Symmetry: D3
């Protein structure tokens, strides 16, 4: 059984925890409790391979972000999450990518760009803009909703498929 260590990063409130909990526990967390550092483990079959996902759900609030770098350092692949109704969270992605490069000491780290909250209509980040950012990084862009489950499995399983290309 193969183990994949995935790390979910991005600004406070973008839905990192809700995405992870939807994937692992199959329900939507409606309330907002800021995360420090939480981990989840689940055995799943992905493309015919039985494997063990260890998912680290990290803090996006600056106040709660103590030692986040020590956690990010352990990851094999990163979901870089912004919310499509939060322009600042999209602009912040650059800084999370720089932190990832820093903690892995590599310019070649498996990553997927995720635009979450796609069930909401106050979109300020258009798909094409995010596609362009992801293209500049050489990674896929996927839209998700932790509320409806749209794209959730695809985002996480795509990250595993990116780690496998590394």
């Amino acid at each position: 059984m193969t183990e994949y260590k995935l790390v979910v990063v991005g600004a406070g409130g973008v839905g990192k925890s809700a995405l992870t909990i939807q994937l692992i526990q199959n329900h939507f967390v409606d309330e907002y409790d800021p995360t420090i550092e939480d981990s989840y483990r689940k055995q799943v079959v992905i493309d015919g391979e039985t494997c063990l996902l260890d998912i680290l759900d990290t803090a996006g609030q600056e106040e709660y972000s103590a030692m986040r770098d020590e956690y990010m350092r352990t990851g094999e692949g990163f979901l870089c999450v912004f919310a499509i109704n939060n322009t600042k969270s999209f602009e912040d992605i650059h800084q999370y990518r720089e932190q990832i490069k820093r903690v892995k000491d590599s310019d070649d780290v498996p990553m997927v760009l995720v635009g979450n909250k796609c069930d909401l209509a106050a979109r300020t980040v258009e798909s094409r803009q995010a596609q362009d950012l992801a293209r500049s990084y050489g990674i896929p862009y996927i839209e998700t909703s932790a509320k409806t489950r749209q794209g959730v499995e695809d985002a996480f399983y795509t990250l595993v498929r990116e780690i496998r290309q590394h």
Copy 2:
């Protein structure tokens, strides 16, 4: 490092998930999303011993309870949870204990009786009544609030201390 497998059982809505999430993630879940079967892992030091807790959070809703027995079978100790404002959940404890005895094939299984929601004032189960039930089973009774954290560490760590007496 020693591993302890703990299983949290009890009627729907009594606060099994909220207790587990408060212990592992240090926040209170205010909303009610019924659980199927979720697991959590955390390394903690308990009485000077570094150990790994694997906590299984089980379904209390009959509808979601498919295969709960297959999960309970793996446990080394059980938190049997009722809510102090839910007389039926207290009366139900007998049936959870019988299920535990069934799946472990033993009359001697480490267990703690937990009266949760002790922050609420619509108490219908008095402390002495629960103490008496626990005494009949030869186990401790502890009151908790997942909301205020009262008793939460004590309940889980007491269960580890009971497993160590086995």
Copy 3:
């Protein structure tokens, strides 16, 4: 290398130990020493797979049967043995199956029904009667002689082949 944990159960004197010793050590035990709980381990190739058999030989005498359930609980597949010259041992099978279901908490446990001592002529259980019992359980019936080796490998290897269908 795959490990299969096999458990041999059945009434006192039916030949559980003699079957196990013939398989593992290639000789026939002529004397009768009642078993408490013995274990055997052997690496064998079964259908091209190298694997490790752990065989638990259990007590059939009521007097020696203390804690048999604790041993049966660990098994992945069960040989349920009666002797073809012992009608009572055949009638007892029902009770061993019920115990297996109890300790595994499943109605779907890999099992093979074994009619031992087929080298003897005081047959009181006819093949068709045992075939019918096994059919009702959804399992194979195989006749063996620990004395001549007839059916011995087939019985144990069939049990492995049943575990593989589970």
Copy 4:
């Protein structure tokens, strides 16, 4: 948990198997079935240490002795067994010790000399004669009966205590 690999060697018929079976299974084998190569495993507490004994019961009959050296090579300590009513088996000990030295490539191998069948009265090897042989090898001499259990635990546990001095 510490593992000790013990090997039992000596002439055909001296009681190697009966000693091993008495230790592991707590009964006396009255019949004589010559051994090829059999192994037994048991967890036991010896002087407060929980450990795993792997006991190899070897062939003493020349006819069955094919590849015995390949088995002896793996052992950490050896019980060198003769029978007190079989002078030839005592005279043969020299050759088993030479084989042990050969397969371990050492003149310093943990060993115990065992005079078995001490329940029988046709003694042709007197205690003092065996004590002298053991003294020349720098090892203990212990008398045993697989039939009455006299000395059986002492012989095997003494061998573990000799391995611990190595």
Copy 5:
């Protein structure tokens, strides 16, 4: 058995390989063959603890230094080596420390400053100057000669003792 991963870094020609080979193989390498990336493993008892040292001997020549950072990243403690007859190698230490901080993402990494070639008399780095540098980093300074063995065990074992304080 505890494993310590040690990494030896410093300018080309300062004696990293000679130090490591003297420790592990007990001879002095007189010739100069520039290293790419070599590893050594040895079980040793240090202060009563049996442990496994994995020592990574890295390139100091810029030409051979491809991917050195990927190797340094794995280390638990670093020997930062300069030669006492090579002022430039001492001035270079700052840059190796910065690289270590970079690859470990920490300002608190176990390290020892080593002034090698102390058997030579063309000293251009005085002890006090190196002591001052080490003091500024909060680490020990030790002088060594790979040729005479002076200080060699002390340097490596001191690094283990620093890792144990971390």
Copy 6:
């Protein structure tokens, strides 16, 4: 990942260490420092299989040869090395083969005969003479130079290919 334990034996000065260091570290050791007992480990892909080579470089000088047999005992395959400009080292091979047979207690041990220093012209052992010796042992003969790298990978990888035929 498969592990192969290789042991390099032969007379003092024939180039055992130089061969091993050329394979593992890709440089030529020009000086002569007699070996006691050194070990090297490297992960390599051989015929599409990722594996771990553990190479034991042994003493050829009689003075340094204490306990060489204890080291040789652990090996899965042996490189038996002589130098093509050292007739005595070739005549000595017989004795190393006898020692190998002794420590492995087998007449069937994976081995390759290696004629090293083939870059030198003072040849006193002709290829055909060594081919004949190897033929009598049922093993390959390969010529090497640790100085030029000729045959070095072939010798070690051939030994792995011989172990795989065992």
